[PDB]
């Protein structure tokens, strides 16, 4: 189906001594493929998926140079923002940035994004037109004027619509064996008595990819939300994801209840019953 490339950057100031902690991660869809950590020994961009390892020295030298440049920009920004907000040199603050591109099934450009946060709140973001800026407050408005004058959106648009998509396509090809494979959820139901006349039914979806999934309960063919619990989708640790949904039912009435599983890896949704 559709695909995306996304980079996430976090810089955290360390007022007591030294420079900010800087961490960058890159993803294709729900697969991490590179990382940089200022605390790590290599001081280089590092591979985190087999299909990126085939890239040669010029690639790794270039990604390292760029990620260090990103880190210096964020380091300077921490000082600038402290000033904008009249904050003390005493406290730790955070800059976050995320950017990337989406393509459709035809691998053509669909959407781009580039957004920036200070202390966990929206600061400035490129609009979907890739021309305009959303500034959350008056400090961000100062940045917006600066970025208008420096043609920033033009450069960002060029990267998002061109370079970003070109390299996404390259990665999708090189990592096709996994990146273009869907792993359907392996599903089962468990039963846990909560008294001698009521029980929890838990509907499990395991080892699936991508992370997107929907789990729903029905009773007698109609949606059931009362007495249900749905946990947030969580990583298994091997590149796949997990989720469960549960419902409390009167014992003996289990057959009324059906769990419904929707996932891109399933041609048709699955229905599970206790039995």
């Amino acid at each position: 189906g559709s695909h995306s490339m996304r980079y996430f950057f976090t810089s955290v100031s360390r007022p007591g001594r030294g420079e900010p902690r800087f961490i960058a991660v890159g993803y294709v869809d729900d697969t991490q493929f590179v990382r940089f950590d200022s605390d790590a020994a290599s001081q280089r961009m590092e591979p985190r998926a087999p299909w990126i390892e085939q890239e040669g020295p010029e690639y790794w030298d270039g990604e390292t140079r760029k990620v260090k440049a990103h880190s210096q920009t964020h380091r300077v920004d921490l000082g600038t923002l402290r000033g904008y907000y009249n904050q003390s040199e005493a406290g730790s603050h955070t800059v976050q940035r995320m950017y990337g591109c989406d393509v459709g099934s035809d691998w053509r450009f669909l959407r781009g994004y580039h957004q920036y946060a200070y202390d966990g709140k929206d600061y400035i973001a490129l609009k979907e037109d890739l021309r305009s800026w959303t500034a959350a407050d008056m400090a961000a408005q100062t940045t917006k004027h600066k970025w208008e004058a420096a043609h920033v959106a033009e450069q960002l648009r060029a990267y998002l619509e061109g370079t970003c998509v070109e390299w996404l396509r390259r990665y999708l090809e090189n990592g096709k064996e996994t990146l273009q494979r869907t792993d359907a959820p392996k599903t089962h139901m468990t039963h846990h008595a909560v008294s001698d006349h009521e029980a929890t039914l838990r509907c499990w979806a395991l080892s699936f990819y991508p992370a997107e999934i929907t789990l729903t309960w029905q009773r007698d063919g109609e949606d059931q939300t009362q007495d249900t619990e749905l946990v947030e989708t969580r990583p298994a640790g091997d590149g796949t994801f997990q989720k469960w949904a549960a419902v409390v039912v009167p014992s003996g009435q289990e057959q009324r209840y059906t769990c419904h599983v929707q996932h891109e890896g399933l041609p048709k949704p699955l229905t599970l019953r206790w039995e």
Partner: peptide
């Protein structure tokens, strides 16, 4: 592949 122009400060 990272953007090679992230140099405009806030």
């Amino acid at each position: 592949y990272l953007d090679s122009g992230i140099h405009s400060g806030a």
